[PDB]
Design a protein around this ligand. Sequence first.
Ligand SMILES: Nc1ncnc2c1ncn2[C@@H]1O[C@H](COP(=O)(O)OP(=O)(O)OP(O)(O)=S)[C@@H](O)[C@H]1O
Ligand SMILES: Nc1ncnc2c1ncn2[C@@H]1O[C@H](COP(=O)(O)OP(=O)(O)OP(O)(O)=S)[C@@H](O)[C@H]1O
Ligand SMILES: Nc1ncnc2c1ncn2[C@@H]1O[C@H](COP(=O)(O)OP(=O)(O)OP(O)(O)=S)[C@@H](O)[C@H]1O
Ligand SMILES: [Mg+2]
Ligand SMILES: [Mg+2]
Ligand SMILES: [Mg+2]
Lengths: 493, 257, 330, 318
Amino acid sequence: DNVVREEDKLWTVKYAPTNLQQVCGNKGSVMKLKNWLANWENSKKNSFKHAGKDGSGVFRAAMLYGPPGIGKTTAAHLVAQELGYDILEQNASDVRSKTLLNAGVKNALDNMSVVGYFKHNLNGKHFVIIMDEVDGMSGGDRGGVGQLAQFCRKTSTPLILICNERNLPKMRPFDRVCLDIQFRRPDANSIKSRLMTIAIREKFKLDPNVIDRLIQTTRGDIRQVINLLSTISTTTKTINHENINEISKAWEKNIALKPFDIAHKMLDGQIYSDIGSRNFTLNDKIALYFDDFDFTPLMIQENYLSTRPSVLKPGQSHLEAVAEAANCISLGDIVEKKIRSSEQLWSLLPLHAVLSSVYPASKVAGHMAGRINFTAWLGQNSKSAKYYRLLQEIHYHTRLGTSTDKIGLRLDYLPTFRKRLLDPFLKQGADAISSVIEVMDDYYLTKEDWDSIMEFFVGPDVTTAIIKKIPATVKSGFTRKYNSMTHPVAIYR
Amino acid sequence: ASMLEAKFEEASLFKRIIDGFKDCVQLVNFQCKEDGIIAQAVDDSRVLLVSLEIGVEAFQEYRCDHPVTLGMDLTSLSKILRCGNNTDTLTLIADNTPDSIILLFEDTKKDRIAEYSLKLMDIDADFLKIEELQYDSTLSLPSSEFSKIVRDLSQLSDSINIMITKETIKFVADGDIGSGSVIIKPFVDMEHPETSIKLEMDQPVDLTFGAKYLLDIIKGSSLSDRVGIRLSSEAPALFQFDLKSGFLQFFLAPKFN
Amino acid sequence: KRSKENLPWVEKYRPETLDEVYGQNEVITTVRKFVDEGKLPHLLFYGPPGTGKTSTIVALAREIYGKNYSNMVLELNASDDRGIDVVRNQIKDFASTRQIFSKGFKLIILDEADAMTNAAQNALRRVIERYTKNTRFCVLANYAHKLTPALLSRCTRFRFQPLPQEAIERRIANVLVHEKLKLSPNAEKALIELSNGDMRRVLNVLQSCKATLDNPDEDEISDDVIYECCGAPRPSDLKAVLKSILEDDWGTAHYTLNKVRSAKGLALIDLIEGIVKILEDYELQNEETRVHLLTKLADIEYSISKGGNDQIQGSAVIGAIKASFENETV
Amino acid sequence: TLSLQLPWVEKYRPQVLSDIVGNKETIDRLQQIAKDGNMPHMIISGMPGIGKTTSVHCLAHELLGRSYADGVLELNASDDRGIDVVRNQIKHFAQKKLHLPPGKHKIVILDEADSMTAGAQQALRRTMELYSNSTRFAFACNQSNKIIEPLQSRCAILRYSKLSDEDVLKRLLQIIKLEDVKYTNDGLEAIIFTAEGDMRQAINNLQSTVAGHGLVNADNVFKIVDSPHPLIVKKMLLASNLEDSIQILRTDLWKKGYSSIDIVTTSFRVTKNLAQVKESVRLEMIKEIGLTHMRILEGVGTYLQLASMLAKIHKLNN
DNA sequence: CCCCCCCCCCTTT
DNA sequence: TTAGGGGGGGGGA
DNA sequence: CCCCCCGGCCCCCCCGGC
DNA sequence: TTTCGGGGGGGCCGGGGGG
Ligand SMILES: Nc1ncnc2c1ncn2[C@@H]1O[C@H](COP(=O)(O)OP(=O)(O)OP(O)(O)=S)[C@@H](O)[C@H]1O
Ligand SMILES: Nc1ncnc2c1ncn2[C@@H]1O[C@H](COP(=O)(O)OP(=O)(O)OP(O)(O)=S)[C@@H](O)[C@H]1O
Ligand SMILES: Nc1ncnc2c1ncn2[C@@H]1O[C@H](COP(=O)(O)OP(=O)(O)OP(O)(O)=S)[C@@H](O)[C@H]1O
Ligand SMILES: [Mg+2]
Ligand SMILES: [Mg+2]
Ligand SMILES: [Mg+2]
């Protein structure tokens, strides 16, 4: 047998934490996870219905999430080993599709460990299923993400899931099934001792005053910090202020910004000045747009009226600059329609970047007056789609009787239908029920069509308060009468 | 090419042995000593343990200078072995500090020699000690019948329950589409002892196991006509197939009560 | 496919040897020198339509390999599947294997490579690099912006210019000799003018002119025949329209434009292009005049490209020209 | 002729770390690593033709030596590199047993790694982590942003800068001495100017000029290498008189056969990078150029549209 | 001990 | 120059 | 006559500029 | 959100071959 010399190993392996206390930072999260896994057995004894002081007794699965290289996997393995559980580990290198998930780990959710039996702690025979890199699985249904979410609800043994981005759409199925544990970027103070110990052991000089800079270079990535030290020390045995700037610039972690950060940066007036534009060039602004080309234009259109500008030309009011920005945004919308047409003119993406984001921002750049808001266009679009679907259903129910298109139905017929369907209840009480039903029968309208019709009106003709004000007895009688009769069908499927 | 030299007079035996458990464990460490070959492998789910013993009598000219350990992936080994022939003699050659092992297929009737090299794997799996245990139930039954029952019951549920009582063996599988049951009792025939189902029940037993694990286990039925199942109250079930001078054993952890 | 005389002239007169390619003397000389001394590099022929790129590469393949070049080269174009899978399997296999027939090197011709996907172009990089000892690549394109920088880094670039007057004249003379045709000097000048450096247009128009003659064995192709077959305005018509626009009142200009167009049913776009060509030579005292002319006429051309009302577009042309030229006084 | 002369980019491809020019500090770091081994996971990024593949291959060769054939696994964009490949072939290579000197490891060279799919990159994470005691990974790419952050965390970042004219001249002089090429200073200056920091391009142009004309002077170099059209476009956009810009457009671009789409795209790029003009003026110019680009994509690609674009740019600039 | 400093991180289909 | 607001954690009158 | 291997459709998810 | 087109990855289906 041949062993590996410690001199042959990577510094990250050579100095990997061995117990939970050596983990730098995120002490609260580590304690929370340890207590959860320690009292998991008691939580099971109570059928996972009684919540303790921490409220973790109602979760059969824990979900650890945070940025890269902060100690998620290390902490998970350390807690699993400390409590004496047998670890069953899965990662992105393994196939975790729905079929493999059901044919693989599914059978281990309520199964004993042969290893835990032949190595004999009372939990030694029980598993701790660690699913690492959950964000590294692709697919909506065949991927098995929803399958893992389902597993998290009925697992008979502890289950720990690890990911990097908890807010991705693919993570939606894990909304409120697991105890969420957040690992944050550790600050320089929580690690300074570790790097100084590594420096003295590795026989190279490191100035403490630059540690804060080094972390800033790695964005709190301890693994990247160790890699940087290992690579730099190969030729430069002393790290001080005389060489910190070059090392930081060469090793800077360039991560794509998120929509809120993109909006904040693009709307800052400083970058649009002569010196600012010379430091942050137009190419940099286009790249910033390209960090997320789908969401950046929506962010800009959402937040371009919520600034105090500092780039106003002489004699120009804020309103005039807003108008110019709005015109440019309209042109950008036209370009976007061109891009997503049958010609697939994706080569126009850079132009879009200028018209939708850079130009209006340069017109209204300044300081954000209030909080930055997420785009409201997506929700409004979904609501409009829902209302149009309901309108189409109503129209094709009433098609046999009316003479109009759906738009004409909304604009013209609906007020009169309101008068002949809703007003009678507010005047004659229950005595009008029959009449209303009669009208419905004349137009093949159902109860759901009635509610949907009542949901369309805007302005002074809003019906929610009026409907809620109706006596409950009248509505109950209306439902009873409608359910006590036979009704026609406009469309026979 | 002299440290380890193990000759099977028939290449079919080793290929069948590998196929017996190639669908459950991928990486396997074979420990070769003067007494023969022993292997122990844990499945990915860590609930099924495969143990293999091959005695010297099974070989023809077994020779081992000093104990050696060979880590092999079973897919590559099966691919290599499928290039041989049953009549051909198969010789395994290994040297000191080997990075690979040589598989030599020789034909006596002809003068055709097929030499293959297989790169060894660096496996750092721990070796577990299995101590002899006295089980409360021991049943020997035909391998074909056991495989048939297992396959029939796996069509209904993901788990199968085995219940052993006085001269009675019951296999149940209850799922969503439906349920199925199979009942057998001990029987012996002098004319056909090979079909004699034998049961020794010190105490009644009741256990449940995963269907996929049993399906993997029954793949060894091609090696032995009979199969021996040992069950304890709360211990892993042992499924054993006997060889000429060795054995293939599957220790399956049951599902928690 | 009963005879070569049944082919369109654009294909009947396809050059078969490098000596039959005109107007690209520098490129032909350089590539011939490369082949003669066995120093052929990876090539990139870039140029506009109908300049001789495909013809040149096919002739080069024939020169290198001879009559059986077809089985000795791997030609792929936009009508074939050229996804990343094709690069990974077919191109890679061809580049790494010896020739079946001879022992010479191997040639891969990626015609119209600007239509290839980015993934396939990226996959081509190491195929080109690894097998350069025995394989060479030729890439043909009209649009260089569709080619990845990595691919361009590995290729030697040759630009095919728009065909000069002399080359078109010589090829026209050869075609006239072959077809037993007569061509007037004015008709020849008009044909060159409308060619715009594309030989395909010359050949197609000449074939149409021959079809137009009542007795092609005795009738000569005059400029009238060319203008009739192509339905294009005469220079005199353009001069008259421009003079009326710049000199007469609106009624006279409108009447003259309508009359000129109705005489032979000319298209407004052809008149616009001819007048633009004429005006480029005009010396203007004010830059604002040129700015207005260019912007307004470009807008009118773009509007015409989508259809619209022809009469309103003609009036717009007249008004734009008059308004622009009113800037030459003050 | 059925014979081929080996290209000089391959004949004089550096075989040792000391023959690579440019990025001196990183090259010395690689030399030290090769000396003492303990190679870590690394990502080498930079622009085309600056010696990334050369650097990786030289490092691997100098580290392994006779064991190179067995201890190196090379995969590039021309090979299959799907998630299945990562999960089977790369994993088998990482698990494989190989006796190496006390300070050496197996190497996986993933050239052009920016083209790898996100699934394969995700699958590589724990493979890198678990088998680091025997295997190390070297990525080479042009755009490091395409490499997912988890992989960047596990690797050492080496960003290659562009080659200066001095290093290019030094390498060209070495190759010229080895080939006894006859040249003139103006010829080498033209080669370097047209190369734009691309060593591969410079060597290819030098070899082509020598083959086609023998003497490497200005005239032959410009006959073989055309003046980059981005500079012509910049001259067109920076002209003060509309007539001058139109003349440049007609004579240097349109009559030379450059397509309208190429002209408009190059104009967009040059305008974006025109640091000498105020950003707002550049934004207006880009708006006009985008209008013209949309018109051209619609099918109206004509000299008149480009002339109108130039007229609008001049009107903006006045 | 509550309060403060200081930072990070979430708003988000 | 720090968008508002909430969470975490070291310091301390 | 029945079971297993492995080529081929088929479906579904994800970029698309430099 | 999403109007083609390319690429990848996973799931069945079925031909052929073997036993
Ligand atoms: N809190 C920490 N303290 C000390 N070292 C750390 C710490 N976090 C990370 N490291 C170092 O970086 C190496 C990797 O740590 P990991 O536990 O893998 O972080 P991670 O958050 O799981 O990264 P990902 O999600 O796989 S990209 C460790 O072996 C340590 O050497
Ligand atoms: N230099 C030329 N000399 C003689 N004929 C030419 C020449 N160029 C084009 N032609 C004629 O036009 C036809 C087409 O020539 P091609 O070589 O196919 O042009 P091309 O540059 O390849 O066109 P593209 O780029 O595919 S649109 C030839 O068959 C010839 O008849
Ligand atoms: N620093 C260099 N020193 C000497 N020659 C170089 C250098 N860089 C490039 N070359 C030469 O150009 C050839 C190609 O170099 P490469 O290493 O392939 O460039 P590259 O950066 O890997 O190209 P990409 O990124 O795949 S497009 C080498 O064989 C050398 O002949
Ligand atoms: Mg991790
Ligand atoms: Mg062509
Ligand atoms: Mg390269």
